[PDB]
Design a protein around this ligand. Structure first.
Ligand code: FSC
Ligand code: FSC
Lengths: 242, 240
């Protein structure tokens, strides 16, 4: 029925504890469709739910894609893997389009604060990036442009209105960096973006609050994990403190 | 879709951890009516193990939340109704498996090892029904599980080696059935200890490269024995 948003959130937390993320996503989708601005808690429940729904397809897509490449010497096995991948892609695009619709219809146009604006624009960039991961041929370029345009708009807002220690500004830099490295095949810009975001958070560490401490320090390590991974083939100088 | 294509897509779904797809593929193979190979048999069981295991895990999480929700009638009802929703999915899965066992797998089982596999499976999925049963229907569900386990137990005791992973796995689950469903811990321990002792008497067989599965089940059997027997004056163990 048309239930209260607190009732739906309660059901979403029940589904989250049971690791039933379809249910959790359906509850938070209904919360979004009521048209009221999401609280930080509801926003995070929505994001986590669809993170898990789409992630199951992305991990399965990579497994099947790898098998398709490993079986390229046999036509029957390769075609079976290809057709299974195409089924998974259809599920993947339907999920991404579902999230992208909720962003366009409810979340982005109703975002009244820069923090939430950046959150939803980063989400838009992420789910277009997930579409880019499985886009083939000539239709990839348009999807990549959509991802970049949302990331860059979120980056402009974030650079002007958010501290470098804010988890959303850090998470934006992390994923935008991955976009440059893996979608645009631009490792220099990807490393520059990751290194700058980390360094700026370190430089202004005194702006980090307790409520953002665990999230921000986690994402700062994710930034360094990627930099260390990418600045391989020589380099990755160890760090001291004197 | 031909038989061999279905099995190949089932293996594909297994690697992708898409167990609903895997179960659907092996159910279609089963419904073709021919006897399953040992590989196809294992694919079918692993598929439905994961499909039903997700509901059982979620059932226990939601049941616990529901039981801990005192003085919040609305929240407790919401938790119960969500558990009941999970229960319905769980029953449909078990009924699906039990129907496949009764219509195809058990009647077509040509040799003892297969008969024991499928009869153990029938005992297992009736046991899963018993875990969420109550009222009047539980007694009948429990009897169905015990009768399937018992026949598998008599066939395996007759025609299978004590080191066979199917016979060991039967002893593991039948003993748990006794401990947990029938509240017969001494029967449960004796069943588990006899199977463990009879297999450890052929320890050289268990060390062979082909007996990794029996080796795993032997760890579980002894784990339950340690859990159920002793555990009072035990001191922690080290190894220099
Ligand atoms: C019940 C609510 C749940 C679903 C658990 O919230 C998830 C998490 O929600 C918050 O954390 C957010 C957040 C995450 C944190 C980095 C988790 O950090 C930990 C474990 O310490 C991961 C999540 O996916 C989430 C919600 C998302 C993002 C992501 C948003 O892009 C659009 C990039 C930034 C990051 C932000 C929003 C984090 O603030 C919280 O601050 C976290 O609490 C902790 C651990 O401090 C909580 O684990
Ligand atoms: C990887 C998965 C696939 C390919 C589907 O096979 C699952 C597994 O299938 C076989 O193992 C069976 C088997 C299991 C073994 C205990 C797994 O052992 C190891 C070392 O991983 C667990 C499975 O669920 C399965 C198929 C089921 C049963 C169970 C059936 O009850 C009705 C009773 C005991 C056990 C038997 C049938 C085992 O022989 C094999 O012997 C295993 O191979 C090894 C190396 O142990 C393989 O991992």
């Amino acid at each position: 029925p048309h239930m209260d948003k607190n009732e739906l959130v309660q059901k979403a937390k029940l589904a989250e504890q049971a690791e039933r993320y379809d249910d959790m996503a359906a509850c938070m989708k209904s919360v979004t469709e009521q048209g009221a601005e999401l609280s930080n808690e509801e926003r995070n429940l929505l994001s986590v739910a669809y993170k898990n729904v789409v992630g199951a397809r992305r991990s399965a897509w990579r497994v099947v894609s790898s098998i398709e490449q490993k079986t390229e010497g046999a036509a029957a096995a390769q075609q079976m893997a290809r057709e299974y991948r195409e089924k998974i892609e259809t599920e993947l695009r339907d999920i991404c389009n579902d999230v992208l619709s909720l962003l366009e219809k409810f979340l982005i146009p109703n975002a009244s604060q820069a923090e939430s604006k950046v959150f939803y624009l980063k989400m838009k960039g992420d789910y277009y990036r997930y579409l880019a991961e499985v886009a083939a041929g000539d239709d990839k370029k348009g999807i990549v442009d959509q991802s970049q345009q949302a990331y860059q708009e979120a980056f402009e807002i974030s650079a002007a209105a958010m501290q470098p220690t804010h988890p959303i500004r850090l998470g934006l830099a992390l994923n935008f960096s991955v976009f440059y490295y893996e979608i645009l095949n631009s490792p220099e810009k990807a490393c520059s973006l990751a290194k700058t975001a980390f360094d700026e958070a370190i430089a202004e560490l005194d702006t980090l609050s307790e409520e953002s401490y665990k999230d921000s320090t986690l994402i700062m390590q994710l930034l360094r994990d990627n930099l260390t991974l990418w600045t391989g083939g020589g380099g990755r100088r160890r760090e001291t403190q004197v």
